[PDB]
Amino acid sequence: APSRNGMILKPHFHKDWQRRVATWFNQPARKIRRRKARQARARRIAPRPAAGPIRPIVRCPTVRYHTKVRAGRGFSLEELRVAGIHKKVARTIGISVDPRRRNKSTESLQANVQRLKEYRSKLVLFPRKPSAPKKGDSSAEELKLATQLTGPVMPIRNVFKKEKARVITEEEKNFKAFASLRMARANARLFGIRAKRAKEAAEQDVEKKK
Amino acid sequence: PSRLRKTRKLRGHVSHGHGRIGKHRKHPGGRGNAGGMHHHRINFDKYHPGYFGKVGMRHYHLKRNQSFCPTVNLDKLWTLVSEQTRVNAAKNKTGAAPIIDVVRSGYYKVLGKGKLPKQPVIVKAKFFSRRAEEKIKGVGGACVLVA
Amino acid sequence: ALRYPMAVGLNKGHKVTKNVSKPRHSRRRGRLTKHTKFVRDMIREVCGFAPYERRAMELLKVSKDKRALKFIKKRVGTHIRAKRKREELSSVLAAMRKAAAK
RNA sequence: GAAACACGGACCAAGGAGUCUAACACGUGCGCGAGUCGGGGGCUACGAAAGCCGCCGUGGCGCAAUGAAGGUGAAGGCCGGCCGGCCGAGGUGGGAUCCCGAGGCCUUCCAGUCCGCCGAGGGCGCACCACCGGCCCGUCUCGCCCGCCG
RNA sequence: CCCCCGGCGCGCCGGGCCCGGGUCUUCCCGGAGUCGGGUUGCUUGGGAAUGCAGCCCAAAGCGGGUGGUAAACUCCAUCU
RNA sequence: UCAGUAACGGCGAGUGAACAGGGAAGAGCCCAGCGCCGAAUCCCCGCCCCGCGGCGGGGCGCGGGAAAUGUGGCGUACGG
């Protein structure tokens, strides 16, 4: 029975909700168990980074977010191909790989190829057996300085490009932004119907001549 | 804190604040939003006009990310950049306008609500309103579109 | 007449140079192999045709392409599959008539 | 309308009934304030606490509305020859408070200044209220014009 | 301090163990009473049917599925 | 978090997801087919050695069986 003035509320409490109430009293215990498992894992792979393999730089879909950059699942196969890394070796040196990614652009492709060059240079590789240092392995001294890296390896910082103050020229002074938006918005709308009537106009000229 | 509630004061009074004639029964008017058209008709028409009926087209698979377009008014357009830029622009005698990229700050469309200080700008936006452009030009700036 | 990259129009969107690469190998599926073709027509010799296919070809010898398609459409299902099945059955009707002439 | 020829009650002890959760509204207290908020996640006996993390504010709510939708999206005036300069953020009535001050505030008498106080009258007018204009979106009516890559 | 359990490498023996990368040429490449269509019943927020099942029909190979309104045409995208 | 939202609903009562975004964790792979290799494969019994409370390893058997109506190696859409 609604009183004088209020909202029309629709509480979804008509089922047997009380039988399926999930309480969070284990939350502090879960945060402890997670951390202990996280430190136990870091000790198991001690010299390797704690965060895991490097992830690639990735745009976001869905125009709400395409101005930002994430960490992808793994490097695409063509990013590895240009970087000169066999796709079955990259996981063994800590490079996330997923064969599903494509590369439509070149800068996204080039930004990740440039990223693998920066990682392959910062990578301290241990010999397979300490007795026999092989080819690609690191020099003996920097193994003494190899320690575990915390946090996401080579973190992805969404950076911008500042633009110096310019003196406004005349064309950009006289550019009609609103008019060009409405115009271009209409051209895309009347593009198909215009192409049809214009193709239709060819139908009567051939009838008019002959 | 139950020691402050009303039930602490109602101990000893028989009906417990619900009257003797009209007892506190279970659901005298129906449960929830019942009788919206029948016996609660007046309440729904006096406080929730427009509640009953259908209006407009249906959009089956709506993704809010497509219609995402946060707007910013010209009154606080200068709050996106630091104050050091705004004072070096007026101090500057070359006439070089600073660039204010709104999409970097987090907005897409620029609306011309406020008044602008008289010094040129270069507003980089995704959309503009007609008044927003007209005000920027009047100050002496330029509207630069981006995608 | 400066051209700004707009968010609306025939060619909206951030301007980015596209790279072309050879397509994924999974795109290639369904493409007919010269060895797989040798099998499907070899079985055509052995198995034959379905009763609705023979009945459709009867509608095709008397030039009832509209009725032949409406028949096949009610059998095989969609209109796309029906259309393709029609020209496949007529190519067989032409290829047997050409061989009958010679 | 009960002392009722209305119903419950032999007597005593103990138990015994507006609770919790969610949502919402308004009031109130506190912190911050065009912002605000870590609630989720990380980082370092009481402690399952507390502290920290903004390149953990993703995100929520707020900061802009309107239309079914495509969409659009929140002052103007003057001067000079549609362009160039200037003034540039409504008004009226009522308004707590502040401001000015015609004057006027005793020891032996006048002249006689500074401070303080009072006051006719006159002002700027907060919040808020009433009204009149203005602006944005929808829609209608009447028109005149402009603009350019197609 | 003393037992027990596995851990961690080191060394010996008996073993299986010849293996990769790049360029070039030449060949090869796919899952059927299934998909899909009709219909019926259940199910779903899924609305000219989201999913599942029965019955009938019943495929293709530059094909097939998806692209949240039924249909034809035509481009794309995307998976297999 | 999206979100009590798009949607469903005597469009009444009520019902009600997903994508994107931020985190926890993070790992990928194998066949059939297509083909190559002299079935190059597997089970079991007998003997020898090694251990023998997870009956396994190696060797020797013109010892038996499975398997050409297809075992094993190479190789799976990221191509080979």
Coordinates of C-alpha atoms (C1' of nucleotides) in Angstrom, one line a residue, chain E:
Chain E
rC1 C1' 67.3 -33.5 22.0
rC2 C1' 65.6 -38.1 19.7
rC3 C1' 62.7 -40.9 16.0
rC4 C1' 59.6 -41.2 11.2
rC5 C1' 57.9 -39.2 6.2
rG6 C1' 59.0 -37.2 1.6
rG7 C1' 62.0 -33.1 -0.3
rC8 C1' 66.7 -30.9 -2.6
rG9 C1' 71.0 -31.8 -5.6
rC10 C1' 75.8 -34.9 -6.4
rG11 C1' 78.1 -39.4 -8.3
rC12 C1' 77.8 -44.6 -10.5
rC13 C1' 75.5 -48.5 -13.4
rG14 C1' 71.7 -50.5 -17.0
rG15 C1' 69.0 -48.1 -20.5
rG16 C1' 65.7 -45.3 -24.8
rC17 C1' 68.2 -40.8 -27.1
rC18 C1' 70.4 -38.2 -33.1
rC19 C1' 66.6 -35.1 -33.1
rG20 C1' 66.9 -28.1 -34.9
rG21 C1' 66.5 -23.2 -37.5
rG22 C1' 66.2 -20.2 -42.3
rU23 C1' 65.4 -19.4 -47.6
rC24 C1' 63.7 -21.8 -52.3
rU25 C1' 61.0 -25.2 -55.2
rU26 C1' 57.1 -29.1 -55.4
rC27 C1' 52.8 -31.3 -53.2
rC28 C1' 48.5 -31.9 -49.2
rC29 C1' 44.8 -30.0 -46.2
rG30 C1' 39.7 -31.8 -42.6
rG31 C1' 34.6 -34.5 -38.5
rA32 C1' 26.6 -35.9 -42.1
rG33 C1' 20.3 -38.3 -40.7
rU34 C1' 25.1 -33.5 -39.0
rC35 C1' 24.2 -28.4 -40.5
rG36 C1' 20.1 -26.0 -42.2
rG37 C1' 14.5 -25.7 -43.2
rG38 C1' 9.4 -26.8 -41.5
rU39 C1' 6.5 -28.0 -37.4
rU40 C1' 5.2 -29.3 -32.2
rG41 C1' 6.3 -28.9 -26.9
rC42 C1' 9.3 -27.0 -23.1
rU43 C1' 12.7 -23.1 -21.8
rU44 C1' 14.9 -17.9 -22.1
rG45 C1' 15.6 -11.0 -21.0
rG46 C1' 15.9 -13.0 -26.2
rG47 C1' 11.1 -9.9 -28.5
rA48 C1' 8.3 -12.9 -37.1
rA49 C1' 11.0 -18.1 -31.9
rU50 C1' 17.6 -17.6 -27.0
rG51 C1' 18.3 -22.6 -26.0
rC52 C1' 16.9 -27.9 -25.9
rA53 C1' 14.0 -32.1 -27.8
rG54 C1' 10.6 -35.1 -30.8
rC55 C1' 8.7 -35.8 -36.0
rC56 C1' 9.3 -34.6 -41.3
rC57 C1' 12.6 -32.7 -44.9
rA58 C1' 17.6 -32.8 -45.5
rA59 C1' 22.8 -30.1 -47.5
rA60 C1' 27.2 -27.6 -49.3
rG61 C1' 32.7 -26.9 -50.5
rC62 C1' 35.7 -19.5 -53.3
rG63 C1' 31.6 -23.8 -48.7
rG64 C1' 29.4 -23.4 -43.7
rG65 C1' 28.1 -20.5 -39.1
rU66 C1' 27.5 -15.7 -36.8
rG67 C1' 26.8 -10.3 -37.6
rG68 C1' 19.7 -9.4 -31.4
rU69 C1' 13.1 -7.6 -36.8
rA70 C1' 10.7 -11.6 -41.1
rA71 C1' 12.6 -11.4 -46.8
rA72 C1' 15.4 -10.7 -51.6
rC73 C1' 19.8 -8.6 -53.7
rU74 C1' 24.8 -6.8 -52.8
rC75 C1' 29.2 -5.6 -50.4
rC76 C1' 32.2 -6.1 -45.9
rA77 C1' 33.6 -8.2 -41.0
rU78 C1' 34.4 -12.4 -38.3
rC79 C1' 35.2 -17.2 -36.9
rU80 C1' 35.8 -22.9 -38.7

